Amino acid sequence: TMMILKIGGSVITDKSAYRTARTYAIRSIVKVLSGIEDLVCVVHGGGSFGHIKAMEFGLPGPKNPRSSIGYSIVHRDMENLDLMVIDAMIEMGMRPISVPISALRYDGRFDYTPLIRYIDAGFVPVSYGDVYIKDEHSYGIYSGDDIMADMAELLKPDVAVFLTDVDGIYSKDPKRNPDAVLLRDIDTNIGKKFESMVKMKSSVKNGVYLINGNHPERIGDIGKESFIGTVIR
Amino acid sequence: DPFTMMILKIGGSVITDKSAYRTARTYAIRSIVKVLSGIEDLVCVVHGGGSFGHIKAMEFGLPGPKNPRSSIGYSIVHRDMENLDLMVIDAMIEMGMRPISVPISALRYDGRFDYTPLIRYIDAGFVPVSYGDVYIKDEHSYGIYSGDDIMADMAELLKPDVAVFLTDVDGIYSKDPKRNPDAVLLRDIDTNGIGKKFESMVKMKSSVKNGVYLINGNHPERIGDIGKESFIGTVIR
Ligand SMILES: Nc1ncnc2c1ncn2[C@@H]1O[C@H](COP(=O)(O)OP(=O)(O)OP(=O)(O)O)[C@@H](O)[C@H]1O
Ligand SMILES: Nc1ncnc2c1ncn2[C@@H]1O[C@H](COP(=O)(O)OP(=O)(O)O)[C@@H](O)[C@H]1O
Ligand SMILES: C=C(C)CCOP(=O)(O)OP(=O)(O)O
Ligand SMILES: C=C(C)CCOP(=O)(O)O
């Protein structure tokens, strides 16, 4: 009855302002996560601790002096964000342990052996969108969503949840066009995330959910008539 | 020879305190890192966690059997070491270096750690940074792998020219310099309570070509004096 969960950068950071964390949201979300008894792995996105320097330094992209310096900066930044989520989890008495993708062997897939040892021993491993060395000439950025896809394939969990700062997948950006309709249900019969969630669904028995991280208690409404967000089925 | 391949350990004795008011010696981290940024072929930096990082681990029962207190303690100890380590990485970034933290707690372990990711970062031109840390030794046991243990392993993989350990005293003395006003500095020690660490630096000599050094981190410009006769410190060679 395992759950894997991603905390979206859009909801724990202000995506428009470099290194701006939203501490309340982090705490508010972690409080709900700590009550989830079968939560086995947490991932988080980077928002303003990721995307802004990545774009400025040429990540992902060819290796060169600027992108090599950017590699160290973006990872350091993502570590700083990660420690705020780790501190909140420790406060709620969880047993988190961060396992950064940057520290794993990569040979086209990442060697998640250390993360699986942590789950087996009863920890909740925490990982996050990160830089990695994709090949001799290229640095890549592996996103929180890519990590979720990988966990979904490896663990075959019962449920996978993504928290973002809107209520679900809509017909159109609910922030620009105030008309947009909520797709409360998508049948296997923002664009890249949607594509990853659909792909994942074939490994996730009981559905992949997008939920508003600003109302994290909605996670407890999964499977109930009061649920608000998107289920991919 | 300014091009000597060096691995270096920044001792918890010099970048931490017993104070209840702060964790880290920020000035000491910065002046050391300033000297490090000028070393041509520094390929790996490791740092320690000091004594109350040691005491705090011991008070969780780490290293030791798995139980609730040790398991909670595992998460806290690792988080505290990561926070210390982020202060070193920050300084390294400000001084123009290309650091990448690679924690032992994230490495594959099967009886030995797989250091492939540190080795690949060195070949990619980064300076990996690691630190004494907790790990899962087996299903019922949590281990602690000290900064000195990491230095011994990286010496064996890398075969560097020199290995440098920074602490808060001028070098190896005949007696604890802090307890004995008549302690003599031993400047050159033929490799053929610092007892343990001194044993470990002698063992490392099979893997370090040109000497293992103990230098006061409060005066890190001494690092740049290696090989000179104005050098203050101890060499085991
Ligand atoms: N004979 C001796 N010569 C020199 N120092 C000694 C001797 N005996 C004891 N010491 C003490 O050893 C201390 C340094 O060793 P310590 O284990 O603290 O090293 P460290 O690498 O900084 O530790 P860590 O990184 O594990 O925190 C010094 O503070 C000094 O007081
Ligand atoms: N069709 C859509 N439905 C819902 N949200 C959308 C849509 N198109 C764009 N968005 C935007 O996507 C954002 C969430 O994306 P993003 O920040 O990339 O997710 P994450 O937090 O996982 O990184 C929301 O802020 C929303 O404005
Ligand atoms: C390292 C960077 C640039 C962040 C990668 O993470 P994500 O792509 O998962 O972050 P959000 O999408 O959730 O912001
Ligand atoms: C958390 C701890 C104790 C790491 C151990 O490091 P040392 O300071 O090199 O002995």
Curated annotation (Swiss-Prot), chain A:
Catalytic activity as recorded in UniProt: isopentenyl phosphate + ATP = isopentenyl diphosphate + ADP
Activity sensitivity to pH: Optimum pH is 6.5-8.5.
Chain sites annotated for binding substrate: 46, 51, 144
EC number: 2.7.4.26
Binding site for ATP: 6-10, 47, 165, 170-175, 193
CDD domains in the record: AAK_FomA-like (cd04241)
Family designation: Belongs to the isopentenyl phosphate kinase family.
Biological role: Catalyzes the formation of isopentenyl diphosphate (IPP), the building block of all isoprenoids. Has lower activity with isopentenyl thiolophosphate (ISP). Has low activity with dimethylallyl phosphate (DMAP), 1-butyl phosphate (BP) and 3-buten-1-yl phosphate (BEP). Has no significant activity with geranyl phosphate (in vitro).
Name this protein carries in UniProt: Isopentenyl phosphate kinase
